[PDB]
Design a protein around this nucleic acid. Structure first.
Ligand SMILES: Nc1ncnc2c1ncn2[C@@H]1O[C@H](COP(=O)(O)OP(=O)(O)O)[C@@H](O)[C@H]1O
Ligand SMILES: [Mg+2]
Length: 275
DNA sequence: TCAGGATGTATATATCTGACACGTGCCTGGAGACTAGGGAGTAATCCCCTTGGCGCTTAAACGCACGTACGCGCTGTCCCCCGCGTTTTAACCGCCAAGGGGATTACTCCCTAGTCTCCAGGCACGTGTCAGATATATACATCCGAT
């Protein structure tokens, strides 16, 4: 009603323009970015020097990462929008711990790395993620795309809240028998008429081939312990998804083991926990 | 008989994966001595099988003729099984937990088999008996088809 001034500067919604970024035209454009890895490792070392343990072993493996190590060796404001009040682009109020979560999300984003949200149940994690995505939309000017894999039960709830506290965002959920699901696919997904896709652990396995053919800004995930095993078919499928970074909204991680946590971390930043 | 539908059948196309190629370590197939026993050649001896016949007995096999009953074709008449639409529910993936089962890969070692040497009891073979089972007759009993 009054937060629309933030919407100024966004391009008009048009599938023809969205096809430029949504579809990844490069058939095999996936490649190891030296710059991103160097930035990640530089910041990681800056926080603490202990992380070289993985790095040196990985340099003992494939040496074209060892030369990245050498490059990072020889060469040696980003102000958080603290949002002391509730973000304007979201109609409603946010509690201070919610605000700190938002700031953590932003700070990790402008560091070319990510971070598992594992807050306790009931503390509006979905609110955190919707707020952060709205931050990317209004401030960072990346409307989409964003995959929001979640459990089938809460799909309606995620859609309800995302339409409630940020109505401007266009989003839908895949569902239904394969005929109407494919209708939605051909009409909006490959039509590039969205900003936030919502699916289920089953649909991701089902409709991967359409979802492969999109450069994914993030791949959000709801309660993540489902992904605790990295030999699970869902984990295998959720690795060919070309993507910039990822998020793992969850409850309590490390439920019955430590290797579990290793794989959970390996999902976010494979180039660090590669071994 | 001809126009009206539903169903493979080709067409072209993006995707997945699992055949195909390549490099290493290990084991086993090949080269080379040595030897001993299995089999090939020989040569007695007895019994069976062959290919021509010949003559005789005696049932079966063949042919012929009524003459039924049954295999086959038609008709009828159900009734039961197929085609089709509509729900719904069970298979089919995906998961989670822990532990047991089964395959390897070494080590170890007992004990139980093979390998010999003697040596006597099996058991197989060649005989000489009897009795269990025919074959006839012979009287009895016991279905089957037509008055
Ligand atoms: N004004 C509000 N501020 C913060 N949280 C709220 C507000 N109104 C509702 N919520 C809660 O935020 C929650 C976000 O969903 P959540 O309970 O975290 O589900 P999940 O744990 O599956 O993500 C909702 O359940 C809702 O009860
Ligand atoms: Mg949740």
């Amino acid at each position: 009603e009054n937060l629309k001034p933030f919407q100024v500067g966004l391009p008009p919604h048009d599938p023809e323009s969205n096809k430029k970024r949504y579809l990844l035209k490069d058939a095999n454009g996936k490649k190891f970015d030296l710059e991103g890895t160097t930035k990640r490792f530089e910041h990681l070392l800056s926080l603490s020097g202990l992380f070289k343990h993985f790095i040196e072993s990985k340099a003992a493996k494939d040496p074209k990462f060892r030369q990245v190590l050498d490059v990072l060796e020889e060469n040696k404001e980003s102000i958080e929008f603290q949002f002391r009040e509730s973000p304007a682009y979201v109609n409603g109020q946010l509690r201070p711990y919610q605000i700190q979560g938002v700031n953590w999300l932003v700070s990790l984003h402008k560091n070319k790395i990510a971070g598992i949200l594992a807050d306790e149940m009931g503390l509006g994690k979905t609110l955190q993620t919707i707020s952060f995505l709205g931050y990317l939309r209004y401030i960072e000017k990346i409307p989409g795309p964003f995959l929001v894999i979640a459990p089938k039960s809460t799909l309606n709830n995620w859609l309800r809240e995302i339409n409630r506290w940020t109505p401007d965002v266009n989003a839908f959920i895949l569902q239904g028998d394969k005929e109407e699901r494919a209708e939605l696919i051909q009409k909006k997904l490959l039509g590039c008429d969205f900003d936030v896709v919502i699916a289920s652990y089953e649909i991701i396995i089902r409709e991967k081939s359409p979802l492969k053919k999109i450069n994914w800004e993030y791949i959000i995930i709801d309660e993540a312990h489902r992904i605790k095993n990295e030999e699970s078919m869902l984990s295998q499928v959720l690795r060919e998804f070309t993507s910039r970074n990822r998020l793992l909204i969850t409850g309590t991680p490390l439920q019955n083991n430590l290797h579990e946590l290793w794989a959970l971390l390996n999902f976010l930043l494979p180039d660090i926990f590669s071994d």
